[PDB]
Structure formats: C-alpha cells, structure tokens
Amino acid sequence: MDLDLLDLNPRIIAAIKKAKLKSVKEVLHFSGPDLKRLTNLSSPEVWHLLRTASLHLRGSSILTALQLHQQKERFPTQHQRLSLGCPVLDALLRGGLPLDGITELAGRSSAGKTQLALQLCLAVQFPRQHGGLEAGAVYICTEDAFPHKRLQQLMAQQPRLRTDVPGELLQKLRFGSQIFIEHVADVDTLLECVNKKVPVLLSRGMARLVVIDSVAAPFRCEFDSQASAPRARHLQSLGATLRELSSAFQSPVLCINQVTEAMEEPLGFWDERVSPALGITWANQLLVRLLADRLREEEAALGCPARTLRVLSAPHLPPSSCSYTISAEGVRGTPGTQSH
C-alpha cells in the first residue's frame, strides 16, 4: 500500500504481495532469516530491500547539534519549559518541567503533592511568556475523590499569587472549563483510560498536560511479593504508552508516587528512611525524579511544619533542595534556601 513508490524489481514486490506484507513497519518487524524464508529469495536482495525501506522511513536531514542549540523555535522540547508558578521552584528546576519524558513526584502523606499538582494544572493555561502552554490539563484520580473545594479556593486566590502578571487578562482566563477530571478503580481500567481516552483529548488540542494522582495506588492492591512479573509487564506497558504520547504531542507527564520505608537489614538511597515505591522497573521509565519530604514535630517543634523539595536525579540537574510553605494562595518556595 506504501512500498509501491519504492524503487525495486517486479520479482521482489511480487514476493512481498504474495507474503502479505503491508507497510514498512511490518517488514522492519521481521528479521533477516524471517524475511528470507517468507520471500524465499536471496540475501543481497533482502539487504537491498531493508536499505530501501529504511531510507524511505527516515534518513533525509543531517541534524547536527548546532540546529538543536541555535534554532530555539525549531525544537521547543529542548528549550521551552513549563513553569511551576513560583520563581524559587523554577530556579531550582532551572525553568520547570521538561516537555518530553515523565516527571515523578514522590513523598509520604500530607507532604503537598496534590497542591503542586493543582498549581501545575492552573499554571499551564497562561501564555507562553508567563511560563504556560496556552492549553488545558487532564487529571486522573486513582485513589479517592477530587478536591473541588480546594481547586475553587485556589482559583479565587489566583490573582493574589500571580503578582508579576498584570491582571487584565486574568479575568479572560476560564480556569474551570479547561480542566478535565477522570476516575479509575483498577489497573486494567487505568490502562484502558490511557490507551483510549487520553489520546483523544491530546490530539484535538484541549489539553497539553497529563497528571496521574497516584500511579502506585492501583498496583499495591492487586500484586503481592510473589507476582512481580505481571506487575513489571504492566508497568513497562504503561510507561511505554505514556512516553510515546508525551513525545508525540509534546505534553509533559507528571506522575505522583508513594513511598515505602527502608526497613534496614544499592539504588543510591543509603541513609534515607524512605524510598520511592514500585521498585526499579518503574524507576527505569522516568526522566526527572523529585521527592517532597516533611519533617515531623520532632524536627518541626519550632512552631510550623518544615517542608523540603529535593531533586534526586536528572540528566541536566545537580542534586539540590529547597524549602516551601503551603498557604491559602498556593505553594510558595522560601527565598534564599537552595542548597548546593
């Protein structure tokens, strides 16, 4: 259906037609011996066929790194960033979340993950100059009900938080109508949702941000310590699908994760009391891994809770940390607190 335009000899295309090969993806799916036995023809013509199919699929532009560096507008994924709404957090993240790959947020309960997720959901609708993407967001609740009251309070207090942006266009922004909420209850339900509903929303352009309220919640209620292989298969499939969608539509994916204690009797966590859940198979699918921690009254006997946001690993970010507080306006980082 598509290999017809390729230059070739009639014998090989007749063999392809007799062998029921549809597109270049199908022929690249099979290997050397498989194609040789299917077409029943010599090796050099198979090599020529593979070369021609590869040249058809790709291999046109010689893209150097100067084209990546200088041409800012040609490759937004390498330069454009999604701001977190607070200058201190953006400085810690050197601009914000990347537009490609998966970003993980992990921590214990009552740490402030949902507040950051809501702030990122609101912050995506700003124009590109103000650190937004001029699009909506998708929220997938996997554990419990969505906090509508807190979202309404944040929307009401939004003019107070965005002090730098002048407020003439703030009233034009319709925050409520550009946020989509979904609910799931099983691992299979979440897989079906990400397979079917999410691409429809991203392709048509309603939203350019995907948030999962708790990826670890469905997986902790089905698989025990003796069923690691099916869980690994499901995690690999979900990660592959999410990465493919994010790369295709240039939409950041933010995943919220839970933690489990060390239970001291590796992966880089030597003296840490808690570690991200879902094992190492899930950790291989991510790009930037964060961690939000709260020191309890033992260290928080000073009057107010102590919250620190830490960077665990990233291809372009040193391991750092800062501090932040949660108020009626949102999440704000404490100035002059970044650690080196």
Binding site: I179, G205, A217, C221
Partner: protein, 319 residues
C-alpha cells in the same frame, strides 16, 4: 486534528454570530462545546434559543462525555456536613463532617473516639435544617464497645424520640478480618433498600494487630487492609455516605524522638494514611476536656480545638 471555528457556518449559523463567539476568546468547536451556558448567554444580544442550537451543533460535532472541573463542582455542590454536637469542632472542621469521604480519628486510650462515634450515630438522623443528614446509621463493631444507653442520652439532649433513634441504627459485630470484610457485601445489599447517611467502623485496625503478627505476615496484612479500604471507598463513592473509622497508636521506642512527651504514631503504615481523606488526632486534656487536632486534610490548615465529654455526649467545655 482540531476543527477551526470557521466550520460553524455550514451547520446553520451566520457569520455575525460565529464571529461574535470568535472574538470572545473562543477559537475552536472543542472550547465552545464544553463552555458553561451562563457564560455563553451573559454576552449582550445572545439569545438562549440560538445558544441551545449552537450547543447541540457542537455536541453532534464535538466528542462529548468528558467531565469538566466547573461542571464537577456545580453538579456535586449539594454535599452534606453532619454536625458533631460541638460548636468548636464544627467551626474547626468548617461545618462538620462531609459525606462521600473517609474520616479517621486516632488517639490513645481514654480519648473520645467512641463517644464521638455515638454522638454522630445520633446526630446523623437530624433534619438537614437542624444540621443532620436525614438518614439511618450503620455501626460495625470489632471490640464489643457499643452502648445504646449512650445514644439515649444524646437523643434526649436533642429532644428526639428515644425508641425511634434505636430503630434507625443497624448494628453488627465482627470477630475477625474475614468477617469484617464479608460484612461489607451485606452492607452494600442493605444500602439499596433504604437511605443511609453514616457508616461507622470501630475499630478498623483493631483486629489486624493480632491476626497478622511478625515481619513475616506484614505484606498480607497490608494488602488485606488496602483491599478493605478500597471497598470502603467504593461504597462511599457509590452511595454518597459518610464513612468514619477509628485507629490506634504505637510507641516510638528509639532515640530519634527528643521531645519525650510520650511519642506515638498511628498504626497501619502508608495505606491507611493515603486512603483516608481527613485525619484527626485526639489527646487528653485537663479534667474531662479533650483537644482535637487536624492531622491531615486536602483543603484545611492544621489547627486545634477543645471539646468535652459530658453526660449528654460530646459537647463544649463548661465555664
């Protein structure tokens, strides 16, 4: 790809109205399909008839079936907040205890985790005007600590019929974790026949301390607790009831703690912390007064309040 706003005229609209919608900030069919009706009709010169017409055009043109935050808030804004019987606690919780969510109270020993449950079991039958929920109550017991004479005192305090209150509170006793989980299917069957407004489990994690013991049985215990909490969440979401559970405490016998005022943490690990929505921490006060503190909440700040346990139930500290 997205369908531009320049497609509306083929569906039965003139250039003037589609332009009027275009310069209003909207630029595609997808944006206007989910747009609120009042925000669509608040523009001067826009009639409701053509608004409904263009909404129908978008609905038959735009793939519908997607929930929106404004619709989610304006569709479920009739939630109910049951009063706890104490003005200070109602003020601290901003009206009381919400429905469709799980609220847990944890504390030590003689704190008021059962008196509060009894008071809620009584007050949940009040009319919505008086601060109730206008429904029955379900009490699942695991320690054999249910006293109807405590409900009678509250029913007399609020001027309700003594016999009627004891007829609206279904009771059940659990002897193990399997029985406790199995009772939820019967609860689901019963909640269809009538209308319920509250469900009480006391205590949720009392039996797990002794049914599974040691490091070897930790994983099975955690998974069983997670499945039980998932079933509770499903029930709360489906029937729109208020689920209140109670927890216990365990000591911290290591030297990390330094404030030395008997450090203690709730049991259950991370599953019970993540599953529940609002967590309260009750501690002993001077005399019969008690102090309630918000431990975790998605839309509330941590604070403190003082109440007391009286002959008529949970109330306010006397002067």
């Amino acid at each position: 790809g997205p369908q531009p706003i320049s497609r509306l005229e083929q569906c039965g609209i003139n250039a003037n109205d589609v332009k009027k919608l275009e310069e209003a900030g909207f630029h595609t069919v997808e944006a206007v399909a989910y747009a609120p009706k009042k925000e669509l009709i608040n523009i001067k010169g826009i009639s409701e008839a053509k608004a409904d017409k263009i909404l129908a055009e978008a609905a038959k043109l735009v793939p519908m079936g997607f929930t929106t935050a404004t619709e989610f808030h304006q569709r479920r804004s009739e939630i109910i907040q049951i009063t706890t019987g104490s003005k200070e606690l109602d003020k601290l919780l901003q009206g009381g205890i919400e429905t469709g969510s799980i609220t847990e109270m944890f504390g030590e020993f003689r704190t008021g985790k059962t008196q509060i449950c009894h008071t809620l079991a009584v007050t949940c039958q009040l009319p919505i005007d008086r601060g109730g929920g206008e429904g029955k109550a379900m009490y699942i017991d695991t320690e054999g600590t249910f006293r109807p004479e405590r409900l009678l005192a509250v029913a007399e305090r609020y001027g309700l019929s003594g016999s009627d209150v004891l007829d609206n509170v279904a009771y059940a006793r659990a002897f193990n974790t399997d029985h406790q989980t199995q009772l939820l299917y019967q609860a689901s069957a019963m909640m269809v026949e009538s209308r319920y407004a509250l469900l009480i489990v006391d205590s949720a994690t009392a039996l797990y301390r002794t049914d599974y013991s040691g490091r070897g049985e930790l994983s099975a215990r955690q998974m069983h607790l997670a499945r039980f909490l998932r079933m509770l969440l499903r029930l709360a979401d489906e029937f729109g009831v208020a689920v209140v559970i109670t927890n216990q405490v365990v000591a911290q016998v290591d030297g990390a703690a330094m404030f030395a005022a008997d450090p203690k943490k709730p049991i259950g690990g991370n599953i019970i912390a993540h599953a529940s929505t609002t967590r309260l921490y009750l501690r002993k006060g001077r005399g019969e007064t008690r102090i309630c503190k918000i431990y975790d909440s998605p839309c509330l700040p941590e604070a403190e309040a003082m109440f007391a346990i009286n002959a008529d139930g949970v109330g306010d500290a006397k002067d």
